[PDB]
Amino acid sequence: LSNQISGLNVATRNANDGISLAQTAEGALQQSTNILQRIRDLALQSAN
C-alpha cells in the first residue's frame, strides 16, 4: 500500500508537469493561430 501511495503521488507530480507542458504547447499553438489569421488578413488585403 505504501508503494502504491508513493507511486501515485509521484505520478500526480509527473502528470502536473505534463499538464504544464501541454499548456505551454497550447499557448504556442494559439499564438501560431493568431499569426496565421494575420497572414490570412494580409493575403486577402493583397488582392489589391
Partner: protein
C-alpha cells in the same frame, strides 16, 4: 515525461548513491564479527532445548 529532465545523468548519480547506501546498510551490521545479512552468513541454528 520521458523527455523533459535532461539531468537523467544526475538522476543516475543519485540512484547510484542510493544503491551504495543500500550496500552500506548491508554492511555495518557487525553484530559479533559474523555479519548478518551481507557477506557470507553461515545460516546457523540457535539451540533452544
Amino acid at each position: 515525461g520521458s523527455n523533459s529532465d535532461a539531468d537523467r545523468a544526475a538522476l543516475q548519480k543519485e540512484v547510484a548513491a542510493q544503491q551504495a547506501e543500500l550496500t552500506r546498510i548491508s554492511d555495518t551490521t557487525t553484530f559479533g564479527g559474523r555479519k548478518l545479512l551481507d557477506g557470507s552468513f553461515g545460516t546457523t541454528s540457535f539451540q533452544v532445548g
